[PDB]
Amino acid sequence: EEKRSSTGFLVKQRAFLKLYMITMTEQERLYGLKLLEVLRSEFKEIGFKPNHTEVYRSLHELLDDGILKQIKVKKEGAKLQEVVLYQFKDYEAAKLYKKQLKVELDRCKKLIEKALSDNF
Amino acid sequence: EEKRSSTGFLVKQRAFLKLYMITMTEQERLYGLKLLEVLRSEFKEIGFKPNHTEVYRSLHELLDDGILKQIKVKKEGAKLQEVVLYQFKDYEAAKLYKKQLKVELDRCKKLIEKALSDNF
Numbered sequence: 001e002e003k004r005s006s007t008g009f010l011v012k013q014r015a016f017l018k019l020y021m022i023t024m025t026e027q028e029r030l031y032g033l034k035l036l037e038v039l040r041s042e043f044k045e046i047g048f049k050p051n052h053t054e055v056y057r058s059l060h061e062l063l064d065d066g067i068l069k070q071i072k073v074k075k076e077g078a079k080l081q082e083v084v085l086y087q088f089k090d091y092e093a094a095k096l097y098k099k100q101l102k103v104e105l106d107r108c109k110k111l112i113e114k115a116l117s118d119n120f
Numbered sequence: 121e122e123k124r125s126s127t128g129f130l131v132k133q134r135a136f137l138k139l140y141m142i143t144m145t146e147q148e149r150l151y152g153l154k155l156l157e158v159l160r161s162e163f164k165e166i167g168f169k170p171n172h173t174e175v176y177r178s179l180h181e182l183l184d185d186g187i188l189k190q191i192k193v194k195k196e197g198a199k200l201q202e203v204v205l206y207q208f209k210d211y212e213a214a215k216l217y218k219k220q221l222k223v224e225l226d227r228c229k230k231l232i233e234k235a236l237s238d239n240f
Contacts, residue, residue: 007167010130010228016235023239046230047127102240108130108232110166115136116225119143119218 005103010111017050017058019101022094025068025086032070032084035059067094125223130231137170137178139221142214145188145206152190152204155179187214 020039024030029038039050062068069089075081088094140159144150149158159170182188189209195201208214 007169009133009136009168013129016129019235019239043231043234046234047227048129048231049127098239102236105232105236107167109229109236111163111168112225112228112232114163114166115139116222116229119139120222 002103003099005100006107008104008107010108011101011104013051013054014058014061015101015104017054018062019098021058021062021086022067022098025088025094028085030068030086032086065093066090067097122223123219125220126227128224128227130228131221131224133171133174134178134181135221135224137174138182139218141178141182141206142187142218145208145214148205150188150206152206185213186210187217 017039020042021030021035024038031038036050036052036055039055043050059068063070067088067090068086071085071087072082073085075083137159140162141150141155144158151158156170156172156175159175163170179188183190187208187210188206191205191207192202193205195203
């Protein structure tokens, strides 16, 4: 127990990816195109390859829900190009999502641990 | 390492439910209608409620893939009713699926443990 939120199966890829993107913004390291390559490089060891569309999708929802905003700066040696940094518009809302996602994760952990002990 | 199989995200509900149904058949306790109620009663503590359609679906696929078969017996005090027990048609194939599912589960475990250590 803690604050409810705890019912369901596991977590969706999109919800998984949003969590990492929130933390990456806290560390000042969520840059636009550059993101899919840093996200895939993060899970290569475990064998997870983030889906191209789930990545682009999670990001737009974080923008459209008003948690992130984008800092754009025109690239000097390139017409029609811009460096994109992501920052918080609503850090409290981001802080909520992270809180609510720990409860999903601890339940996932217990579910997988249950399945492993019951079946083998 | 062990025998490969190890790439992807987590596991689907259907694949999760098939594992439990394989083990339940090993213990001579997979009875037809009775199943959804025993499957839900198994995860109430953790907060997982098996979807009605995922259950009926996993079961038909286990039948149609040729891993299970059904032993039917007519109920004596009921016309058009029958007791249904499930048994293996192909235990080696069932034994394979279980082998292949342990590799998915151990990867899930490591993925959730990663997410928990990185983000909090």
